[PDB]
Amino acid sequence: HHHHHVPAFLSKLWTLVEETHTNEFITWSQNGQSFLVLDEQRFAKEILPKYFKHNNMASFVRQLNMYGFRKVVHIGPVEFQHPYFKQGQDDLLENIKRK
C-alpha cells in the first residue's frame, strides 16, 4: 500500500534494488542508505530493458536526477542515494518529489 501514490518509476526502482535475484547488477550499499550499480554498461543492457523498457543509462540517471537522487563518490560502478530511498523502508517513498 506504500506504493499507491508513488511514481511508477520509483516504485519499480525500489523493488528492483530490493530483489535479491538482481544483486549481481544493482544492490543496496552503505548499510542500506545508498544503492550501487556494479557496471553501467551491463546494467543498461541487461536490467533496464526488463524493468524500464529501454536500454539507455543516461536516461535512467536523468530520471534519478529529476527525483533528487545524488551520486556518492569516493574521496564502472556508480553509487546513488536519496534520503527517502532506503533498504526495507518503502514507507518513505511517498516523500520523494519531482523537480
**CA gap 86, 34 in Å, rounded:** 7
From the list K ion, Na ion, none, partner contacted by residue 23 (C-beta under 5 to 8 A by kind): K ion
Task: Candidates 3, 12, 22, 94: give the one binding K ion (CB under 5 A).
Answer: 22
Binding region for Na ion (CB under 5 A) out of 15-23, 39-47, 53-61, 65-73: 65-73
Query: C-beta of 6: minimal distance to K ion in Å?
Result: 18
The grid coordinates listed for 6 are 508513488
Binding mask 3-42 for Na ion (x = CB under 5 A): -------------------------------x--------
Interactions with K ion, residue window 41-80 (CB under 5 A):
none
For 5, phi then psi, to 5°, come to -100, 10
- Among residues 23, 57, 53, the alpha carbon closest in space to that of 40 is found at 57
Residue 45 or 70 having the CB closest to Na ion: 70
Which one among 59, 89, 95, 97 touches Na ion, defined by CB under 5 A? Answer: 89
